[PDB]
Design a protein around this ligand. Structure first.
Ligand SMILES: [Mg+2]
Lengths: 199, 79, 50, 322, 147, 235
RNA sequence: UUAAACCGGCGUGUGGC
């Protein structure tokens, strides 16, 4: 949360659509890191085919600027909520309050010229406490273009390649969910014919 | 190391003939395989050429003289 | 009001405390002012421009 | 006296809490107050033996950017709380701790399967929150002893240690001390004036012992000072002819050539650990070596001769490193 | 033996490639460049030292010659790649050879706010302070008494 | 591994034989700063030696004075005496006389050659004298102290009200004249950065600079002896 | 004839200096 503020922070956080705002008040039944169950109170319940509400939070997904957008729940079991209340602190939010970044101890003195024009001096305590470490999601999309000679396939039988490069691949040809990659490594097995007709 | 080369220019004028003489000297040093006239401190060929010029040992005129001596050596070797 | 809030926080009213050097360990004259600032990481990371 | 003054000594490890501790060194003659204070503060905050978590593994999750049906927070927050967890190992330097939990409730440090050589400094440190009746978590936690602080990126050493998907890496931030304050005061010397007593308070993780940490810092400082306590012109560039021609890498044992253990003990049946002696061992001593048949001999031939070396080469300079 | 082995070694990032890098950049100047180039001083020659990270370290005093603050400016660097080019960058493009402005006679190596503020605070004298009215025997004695 | 790194020095430059430059490489990430600072602060104040502390001219009894026979004021006399480095034997405190006449500059070689003291530079000029009929004498008492003892703090205590009717001088028991440590970045096989220390120091010549560094290291080790591992290895 | 070796063009929008 920003230590100093302006009072407007409680609005832009709520009026934005990034966070999961509660549409119908009531109680919270099942709190999970992915979903939220809201049992509606009987006064606001519909006279027919009524029930509860299920808010499915969005997980880590790529945005337009390769920035991960993640919704984190902020309520507990049995906690009552009202209409218009926030259910999940989205990115850059802190308990229904929009918080851009971290507050930090700052001194104003030239330290061995390491702040010569405008440069910033940071301590190892910042990176050790896992303070400013951000996450970026990058999308890699391969297309199976169709040629006038046979279609495009994703058969994982790659010729003229080492076994170490084929280790990350599954039986299908797409690497599993959670295998990191460092250098150029095949993760889609799109090998296709080229040989002309008239054979 | 060599911080500045102004003293190379105060004795070899115009600051541009120094370029030519350093070019030819370091070219004869690298590929020609000549001997550095000063004990180097394990630095680049350019800076040892510049420093040998700095010790008053190499200018354009003595460079032409050494070229003439090499030409005479070639004449004597061809025989 | 900032003065009285600092007073309630038992911190100096001027905000300037005496700081000791991290390396030499001596006392700095003309005490520097220190506080808690709200800083932001901008979308100009070095790993994308290098 | 006028010269060769007396030395200080430790007289207090007064602790006001489990972490915030205070020590009082005394007496310091003059100027040694700030000197020793800053020196000990830098040595303590810089390097102290820490035993924080370095590697985790939960069965259900594959990567820290995922979730788990039942836990309140994400895997990232779990890694945060694990980094914040402190622990003290005594017997070994690296250890694996298992944490199994089920049912609704706040999962804290006390719920882990502790041991004798491993002691949790504080059990009230919450790790996560299980928010479902039939919700369970089983996790393995690697805790190793080291020096300083190393991130999770540069800690990679090969291209196979992270092949297990469940092995999640957290940046090992092990530093028992958190802040080291100190000050000098007028020591209550029996008969003298203006003697400096150095009071040093440390807010720490509670893992390391205060007096033990102070003493270890003094050890490190004196060991570093021993460098120029008898300083002289000492050099270690090989400005000479030492360039050898013996087997350069084949002086280390056989086991580091990426082969099995049965062949390792088999090469130990001939009492040949280093190939520096096996380089003087041709192929006539392969099938005579006990239990070298079809596949073990296949591995021996493959992982040895394919790396540029030949099995059996005559040389005469492996003893003198020439 | 071959260039393929050297390429594989430099791609594997071994430790044997590092000392070679120290050898080849010991006295090999490079060409520092600003994206907007107004005058001849926007391009200079510099002796690089290897620093860890992903950012270029630059002398603070030459920054005023580039007119480029540290608010996110991105600077370029080229290599001479040729004997003539190396000795040319040394002779006609070194930062030491370019200290006076090509427009007027004032030096372009004018100090900046930090060092001048430090010097002003240092030489600004007061009426009463510790060690007033004493006598000093030399600058080294003054430095010792200040420390 | 809980085991640190020990430096391998590269240069002990002994230019001018009294102003040396010792380099050390490499150190840990922050050990260079603390080592340089501790050594500097120790050598500055807590470094025992011997220097002049009392001066008494039998003709003048004040700092301020209009004294003939010398074209330099008494303040110049005190300043020249302040830099007079002398090494004393087992004696802790001794006085010396400088009765001399002549033409030119009274120097340090004119001191009565006692067997308990040793002047490091007899060629040190003290005071230029009037070229005729000028015979000024003075006694100088030295002491074996700890470091720099200024005039104000010292004269306030040693003489309650100046009962003997004496003069003062800035006592500098530290044999080192100046010292400055500078840390730079040095590389090992692939590690990020290590402290490479460069200590440039200059003493009064009574002891070599490396000898002063050795003495400071030994005094710091003896100060730390109370806590340093109790032993070589503890086990 | 045979053998060996090697093998971003355009517009648009945004942002920064
Ligand atoms: Mg700018």
């Amino acid at each position: 949360k920003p230590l100093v503020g302006t009072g407007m922070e409680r609005a832009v956080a709520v009026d934005s659509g990034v966070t999961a705002v509660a549409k119908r008040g009531g109680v919270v039944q099942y709190v999970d890191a992915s979903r939220i169950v809201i049992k509606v109170n009987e006064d606001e319940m519909y006279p027919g085919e009524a029930g509860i509400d299920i808010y499915n939070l969005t997980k880590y997904t790529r945005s337009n600027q390769n920035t991960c957008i993640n919704q984190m729940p902020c309520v507990s079991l049995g906690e009552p909520v009202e209409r218009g209340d926030v259910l999940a602190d989205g990115p850059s939010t802190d308990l229904g309050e929009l918080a851009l970044g971290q507050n930090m101890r700052v001194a104003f003195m030239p330290w061995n010229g390491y702040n010569f024009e405008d440069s910033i001096l940071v301590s190892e305590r910042v990176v050790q406490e896992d303070r400013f470490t951000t996450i970026h999601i990058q999308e890699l999309a391969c297309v199976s273009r169709d040629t006038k000679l046979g279609p495009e396939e994703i058969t994982a039988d790659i010729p003229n390649v080492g076994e170490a490069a084929l280790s990350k691949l599954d039986e299908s040809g797409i690497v599993y969910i959670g295998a990191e990659v460092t250098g150029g490594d095949i993760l889609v097995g799109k090998v296709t014919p080229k040989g002309e007709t008239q054979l | 190391a060599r911080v500045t080369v102004q003293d190379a220019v105060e004795k070899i004028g115009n600051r541009f003939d120094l370029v030519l003489v350093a070019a030819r000297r370091a070219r004869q040093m690298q590929v020609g395989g000549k001997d550095p006239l000063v004990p180097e401190e394990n630095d680049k060929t350019t800076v040892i050429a510049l420093r040998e010029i700095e010790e008053g040992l190499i200018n354009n005129q003595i460079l032409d003289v050494r070229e003439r001596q090499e030409q005479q050596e070639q004449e004597a070797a061809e025989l | 009001e900032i003065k009285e809030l600092l007073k309630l926080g038992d911190l100096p009213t001027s905000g300037q405390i005496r700081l000791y050097d991290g390396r030499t360990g001596e006392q700095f004259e003309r005490p520097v002012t220190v506080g808690y600032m709200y800083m932001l990481k901008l979308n100009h990371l070095v790993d994308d421009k290098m | 006296s006028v010269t060769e003054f007396l030395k200080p000594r430790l007289v207090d490890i007064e602790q006001v809490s489990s972490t915030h501790a205070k020590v009082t060194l005394e007496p310091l003659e003059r100027g040694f107050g700030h000197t020793l204070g800053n020196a000990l503060r830098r040595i303590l905050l810089s390097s102290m033996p820490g035993c924080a978590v370095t590697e985790v593994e939960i069965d259900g999750v594959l990567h820290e950017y995922s979730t788990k049906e039942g836990v309140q927070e994400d895997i990232l927050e779990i890694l945060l709380n694990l980094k914040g967890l402190a622990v003290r190992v005594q017997g070994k330097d690296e250890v694996i701790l298992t944490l199994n939990k089920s049912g609704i409730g706040p999962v804290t440090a006390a719920d882990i399967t502790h041991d004798g050589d491993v002691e949790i400094v504080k059990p009230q440190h919450v790790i996560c929150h299980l928010t479902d009746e039939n919700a369970s978590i089983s996790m393995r936690i690697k805790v190793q002893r080291g020096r300083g602080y190393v991130p999770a990126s540069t800690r990679i050493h090969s291209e196979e240690d992270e092949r297990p998907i469940g092995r999640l890496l957290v940046d090992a931030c092990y530093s028992p001390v958190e802040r080291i304050a100190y000050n000098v005061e007028a020591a209550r010397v029996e008969q003298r004036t203006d003697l400096d007593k150095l009071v040093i308070e440390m807010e720490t993780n509670g893992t390391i012992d205060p007096e033990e940490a102070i003493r270890r810092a003094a050890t490190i400082l004196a060991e570093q000072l021993e460098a120029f306590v008898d300083l002289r012109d000492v050099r270690q560039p090989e400005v000479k002819e030492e360039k050898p021609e013996f087997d350069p890498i084949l002086l280390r044992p056989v086991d580091d050539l990426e082969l099995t253990v049965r062949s390792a003990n088999c090469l130990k049946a001939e009492a040949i650990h280093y190939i520096g002696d096996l380089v003087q061992r041709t192929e006539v001593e392969l099938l005579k070596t006990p239990n070298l048949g079809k596949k073990s001999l296949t591995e021996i031939k493959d992982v040895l001769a394919s790396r540029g070396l030949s099995l059996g080469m005559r040389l005469e300079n492996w003893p003198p490193a020439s | 033996t071959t260039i393929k082995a050297a390429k594989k070694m430099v791609e594997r990032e071994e430790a044997v490639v590092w000392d070679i890098l120290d050898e080849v950049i010991r006295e090999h100047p490079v060409l520092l460049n600003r994206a907007p180039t107004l005058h001849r001083l926007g391009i200079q020659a510099f002796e690089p030292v290897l620093i860890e990270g992903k950012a270029i370290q630059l002398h603070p005093l030459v920054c005023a010659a580039y007119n480029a603050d540290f608010d996110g400016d991105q600077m370029a660097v080229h290599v001479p790649l040729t004997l003539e080019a190396q000795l040319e960058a040394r002779a006609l493009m070194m930062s030491t050879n370019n200290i006076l402005s090509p427009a007027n006679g004032e030096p372009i190596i004018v100090p900046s706010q930090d060092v001048v503020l430090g010097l002003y605070y240092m030489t600004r004298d007061c009426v009463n302070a510790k060690g007033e009215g004493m006598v000093l025997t030399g600058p080294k004695e003054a430095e010792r008494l200040y420390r």
